[PDB]
Amino acid sequence: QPDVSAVLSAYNQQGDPTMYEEYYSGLKHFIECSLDCHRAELSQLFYPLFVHMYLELVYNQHENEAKSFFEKFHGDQECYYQDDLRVLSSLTKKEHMKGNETMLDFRTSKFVLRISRDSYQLLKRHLQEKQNNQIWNIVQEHLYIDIFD
């Protein structure tokens, strides 16, 4: 397991923080409008992407944006993540993350994700529609994700 500082290194490369809600809303609509088979697989992305993006906003001192992002998307996460989310919501400032062992519980790389190539194809295409979609960067650099036939 990585140390705290290694975990926090994951939240360095921020995107345009004013667009995070747009990116996540875009993904949500894309996933919800997919065929059942693709939607079932891709729905796995929701929680880890939400946690990473929120912490990215907080870590880069976009406190307003983080609060707003959390308020908009925490509600539709799986019911069994809502206890983890209450704890996540107490982390509102960069100060709260630094030197904090609880960050181990939210490390993006602990969420194992497996999807079909078909689903990946389609996801990749959606995420390349908008220029420098930050979710595409998180998928490339931080998600523990494998694709299969």
Structure tokens at 80: 């069994």
Residues that bind Ca ion (CB under 5 A): 80, 83-84
Instruction: Rank residues 74 and 94 by Cβ distance to Ca ion and give the closer one.
Output: 74
CB of 106 to Ca ion, least distance (A): 12
Instruction: Rank residues 83 and 149 by Cβ distance to Ca ion and give the closer one.
Output: 83
CB of 84 to Ca ion, least distance (A): 5
Instruction: Rank residues 85 and 122 by Cβ distance to Ca ion and give the closer one.
Output: 85
Instruction: Rank residues 79 and 149 by Cβ distance to Ca ion and give the closer one.
Output: 79
Q: Which of 145, 132, 148 lies closest to 45, judged by CA?
A: 145
What whole-number distance in Å separates Cα of residue 53 and Cα of residue 57? 6
Q: Residue 133 to residues 5, 20, 24, 75, 130: CA-CA distances in angstroms?
A: 25, 9, 10, 23, 6
- Categorise residue 99: left if φ over 0, alpha if ψ from -120 to 50, beta otherwise: left
CB of 80 to Ca ion, least distance (A): 5
Instruction: Rank residues 86 and 117 by Cβ distance to Ca ion and give the closer one.
Output: 86
CB of 47 to Ca ion, least distance (A): 10
Phi, psi of 19 (to 5 degrees): -105, -10
CB of 124 to Ca ion, least distance (A): 30
Q: Which of 67, 137, 132 lies closest to 108, judged by CA?
A: 137
